[PDB]
Amino acid sequence: KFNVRLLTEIAFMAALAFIISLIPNTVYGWIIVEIACIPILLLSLRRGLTAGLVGGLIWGILSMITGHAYILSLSQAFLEYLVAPVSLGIAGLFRQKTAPLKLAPVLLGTFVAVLLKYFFHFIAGIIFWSQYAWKGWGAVAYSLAVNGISGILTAIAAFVILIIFVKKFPKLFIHSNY
């Protein structure tokens, strides 16, 4: 019914995030453009918070069980491959249920959710990845740069794609019965 439709959409966007995560996205070392965020963001914005959290969760789990996650420790895996991708669901708080679709909430929702995801990577960068800190850099400054810049680039890409979607396919962002 409504729920079968909702569950299928969650599953498809999680599998799509995963499939897109296979596209090489490295800019320089762990500075990356995470375009794989976008189907979770779209899902969160169309179907709301809970749907998005769960899509994030399923994507994280696929990353791990398929071997495509970089795992250093249990707690680090939990932080970066469960919490971080789930955290994209916060975009669901900016869902629009009624037309016309406004651009500003799409962009606010995306910004806040990518920010929150890369805030957890930033925290992880400090805790788990400091042995890789560039010559002359403190851990915090190194994680801030790497994850600050990845966050920004990820949001740029998420904005380019979702802006195109808002202008050419606005109904993607408004769930409709019927």
Q: Residues in contact with ligand BNG, total (CB under 6 A)?
A: 15
- Six-digit token string for 56: 């994030």
The region of 8-16, 47-55, 87-95, 124-132 touching ligand 2VY under the rule CB under 6 A is 124-132
73 binds, among ligand BNG, ligand 2VY, none (CB under 5 to 8 A by kind): ligand BNG
- Six-digit token string for 91: 């975009």
Furthest CA-CA distance within the chain? 59
- Six-digit token string for 101: 């679709």
Does residue 80 bind ligand 2VY (CB under 6 A)? yes
Does residue 141 bind ligand BNG (CB under 6 A)? yes
Does residue 30 bind ligand 2VY (CB under 6 A)? yes
- Six-digit token string for 107: 């962009």
SS3 call for 121: helix
Residue 149 near residue 155 (C-beta atoms within 8 A)? no
Q: Which residues bind ligand 2VY (CB under 6 A)?
A: 30, 32, 70, 80, 121, 124-125, 129, 143, 146-147, 150
